[PDB]
């Protein structure tokens, strides 16, 4: 079962140089062509180019020829995108994308599987991790409150993933300070409050920090 798992996306100073990385598994890397599609926030998708892991040869886009650079590592089943001279408009979510089906079928050529995307955000400000305070509890509705972090995104889950139904992770807001902030609530049986533990995991990958806060009443 094919999984593409990306990483690398954080803050980059305007001018600086980041490197993202797709990490493919569940098939043979050197049989398919990875690509990179980019999507600015609220916007359309933009093709970045691709690379053939088996020949190492790169399919380019002549508006990115200069700053960007695609590549791949057979040994680690990993395809990368290097990005230099970054400017405010390069902020976007960067997806990798496999291109099936097997071969070149001349009728079938599409990005079948994709990575989950990563958020490169290029701006002068500095990184800060979030501070997580709780929103303690028929039906009871608890949550936790993520506050004062930079840059987007923070990734919230509940009971480390066991709790998916009833969750609601609101979109962040920018504060006059310049740090983001969001809330994330679930609803649960009251009768279950005494006997199930509710914990929220606020993973902030642009600073390598995950804060798990336990919500009691």
């Amino acid at each position: 079962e094919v999984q593409l798992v990306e990483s690398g996306g954080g803050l980059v100073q305007p001018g600086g140089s980041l490197r993202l990385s797709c990490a493919a598994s569940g098939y043979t890397f050197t049989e398919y062509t990875m690509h990179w599609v980019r999507q600015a926030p609220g916007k359309g998708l933009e093709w970045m180019g691709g690379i053939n892991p088996n020949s190492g040869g790169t399919r380019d886009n002549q508006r990115f020829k200069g700053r960007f650079t695609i590549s791949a590592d057979t040994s680690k089943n990993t395809a990368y995108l290097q990005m230099n001279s970054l400017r405010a408009e390069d902020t976007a979510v960067y997806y990798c994308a496999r291109r099936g089906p097997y071969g070149n079928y001349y009728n079938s050529y599409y990005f079948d599987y994709w990575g989950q995307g990563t958020l490169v955000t290029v701006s002068s400000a500095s990184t800060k991790g979030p501070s997580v305070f709780p929103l303690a509890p028929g039906t009871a509705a608890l949550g936790c409150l993520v506050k004062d972090y930079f840059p987007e995104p923070v990734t919230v889950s509940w009971n480390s993933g066991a709790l998916t139904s009833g969750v609601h992770t609101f979109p962040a807001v920018l504060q006059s300070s310049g740090l983001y902030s969001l809330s994330s609530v679930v609803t649960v049986p009251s009768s279950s409050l005494g006997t199930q533990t509710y914990i929220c995991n606020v993973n902030h990958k642009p600073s390598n920090t995950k804060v798990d806060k336990k919500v009691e009443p």
Partner: protein, 206 residues
């Protein structure tokens, strides 16, 4: 550099209705058009390739069509989980270009917002500020107003729900240390269509 023009920009249909998405290539291409479905939070997902053929295991209420440079995505019968943004990609002439998107929103029957309210946490109060969180949960339609007093609260709305097509709203009221402890009773006032009378949830700081 072939330029895909998608219409309409965004439409609201009803569940089981039939939705038609257009996409018009700037210059001629063959059947070389792919159809992607991107859902909020997720990466784009293929549905229809070679302009009409269904990706393995895609609900066959999905069709794609072709008349000229004009391309037509057909959700025969809209479902609440089809809330998405849909994109055409052309794979005729490099560089590959996508559409601009169409946002496909679901019109359903009115729901009223279950209201909840959250005092500031002991833990947060030491920072020097306090944040009161009014939560409206699972209402439709999206219009509704929150009243605390103003200048203070930001607010935000979950995207459309993929199961009951409802919204949700997090209005957060962030005043200061001991500006909180000055006064005593906090309440958000909620006003929404499916609620006959403007509902108010409140707590006394103590």
């Amino acid at each position: 550099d072939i330029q895909m023009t998608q219409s309409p920009s965004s439409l609201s249909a009803s569940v089981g209705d039939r939705v038609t998405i257009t996409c018009s290539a700037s210059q001629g291409i063959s059947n070389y058009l792919n159809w992607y479905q991107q859902k909020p939070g997720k990466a784009p997902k293929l549905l229809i390739y070679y302009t009409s053929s269904l990706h393995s295991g895609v609900p066959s209420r999905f069709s794609g069509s072709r008349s000229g440079t004009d391309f037509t995505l057909t959700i025969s019968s809209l479902q609440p989980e089809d809330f998405a943004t849909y994109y055409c990609q052309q794979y005729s002439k490099v560089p590959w270009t996508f559409g601009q998107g169409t946002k496909v929103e679901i019109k359903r029957t009115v729901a009223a917002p279950s209201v909840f309210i959250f005092p500031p946490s002991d833990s947060q109060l030491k920072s020097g500020t306090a944040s009161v969180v009014c939560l409206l949960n699972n209402f439709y339609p999206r219009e509704a107003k929150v009243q605390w007093q103003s200048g203070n609260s930001q607010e935000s709305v979950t995207e459309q729900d993929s199961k009951d097509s409802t919204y949700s709203l997090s209005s957060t009221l962030t005043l200061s240390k001991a500006d909180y402890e000055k006064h005593k009773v906090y309440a958000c006032e909620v006003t929404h269509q499916g609620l006959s009378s403007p509902v108010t949830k409140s707590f006394n700081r103590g």
